[PDB]
Amino acid sequence: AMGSMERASLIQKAKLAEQAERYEDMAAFMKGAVEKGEELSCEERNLLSVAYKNVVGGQRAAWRVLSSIEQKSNEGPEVREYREKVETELQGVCDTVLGLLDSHLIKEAGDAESRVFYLKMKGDYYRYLAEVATGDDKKRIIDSARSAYQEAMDISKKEMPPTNPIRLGLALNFSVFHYEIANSPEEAISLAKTTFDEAMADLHTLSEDSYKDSTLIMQLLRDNLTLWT
């Protein structure tokens, strides 16, 4: 759909769409940029991720409202039909993101920073599919999330310092996966604690600005540990 627009113009418009809080537009501009076939810079990867996280975040919040109403009603067909409509739209967005990662962002990502970023995205979007999945391929979807997060973890632990914000955010989100999706709260708590402690011990190496970036995510790990223990 964006084939006739220059890559640089799509990137510029994605930044404008963010400022205007037009996240569907932002995601469409960034999909167009990915489909130009060139690798993405750090900033461009963040624009892609921000766009889709906002789009799918609104869909997830709506699905949760509707699922709650539907569960109360089961204690006409309209609530189920509308929850299904939102669910299908959410699944379509997750499939779109996963398709960009598979064609061909991951295979072209050779540096640890880009490969970990994309594999964390892959884990996240399979996790969002798992949130709405029921039984049939719930297990296979959960395993796809776990596999993507695990590969990202393995690379991050070999190639990045323990304070790296992407490594920290990956560990945070994988811990949420364990707690909320995989029914493994002890694994979630262990991962969050080990991640926090190893980051704390590496803060001394950081500049003031890097310190602020890392400690912000550490506080999120602490916030979950406080809720889980």
Binding site: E18, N46, V50, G57, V176, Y179, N224, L227
Partner: peptide, 9 residues
Amino acid sequence: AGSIPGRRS
């Protein structure tokens, strides 16, 4: 339980 908000560049 909170994941990365991730909604602002």
